[PDB]
Design a protein around this ligand. Structure first.
Ligand SMILES: O=C(CCCO)NCc1ccc(F)cc1
Length: 145
């Protein structure tokens, strides 16, 4: 029963699943620290972001609820294989790292905003987060190293 993870029950199907309250990931199978990790991310900003502006939009006006809907939609397409994380990050991430397919490079604890850092270090290599909230907006995080 690894830390961060809990058992839960599907409302629609009644089948057990597992949920991580640090990364907001959820999955059906029973789940399986380094100085540094490397992550990519897809950021969707909203009107309450620290700076409501990006390379995509001079004035970001979408609500925090609308931003969460967009994040949820991207997660669905990534999990179905219909779209690649890197493709969606390049097209739709409100972070300048979109130009690098979302790649932020490597970082230690104490550099990123805390909810982002905690989710990044709690992911296993290759694992992707659910929606992660920071003062910048809502993130999907992919731990690559
Ligand atoms: O430089 C890299 C990747 C480095 C090698 O892995 N990405 C560009 C970038 C990173 C963080 C940003 F906040 C904005 C842009």
């Amino acid at each position: 029963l690894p830390p961060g993870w809990e058992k839960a029950m599907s409302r629609s199907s009644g089948r057990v699943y597992y949920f991580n309250h640090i990364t907001n990931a959820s999955q059906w199978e029973r789940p399986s620290e380094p100085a540094r990790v490397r992550c990519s991310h897809l950021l969707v900003k909203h009107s309450q972001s620290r700076r409501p502006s990006s390379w995509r939009q001079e004035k970001i006006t979408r609500t925090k609820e609308e931003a969460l809907e967009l994040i949820n939609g991207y997660i669905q397409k990534i999990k179905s294989g219909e779209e690649d994380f890197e493709s969606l990050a390049s097209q739709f991430s409100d972070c300048s790292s979109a130009k690098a397919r979302g790649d932020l490079g490597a970082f230690s604890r104490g550099q990123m905003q805390k909810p982002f850092e905690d989710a990044s270090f709690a992911l296993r290599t290759g694992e992707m987060s659910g929606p992660v909230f920071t003062d910048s907006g809502i993130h999907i995080i992919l731990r690559t190293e």
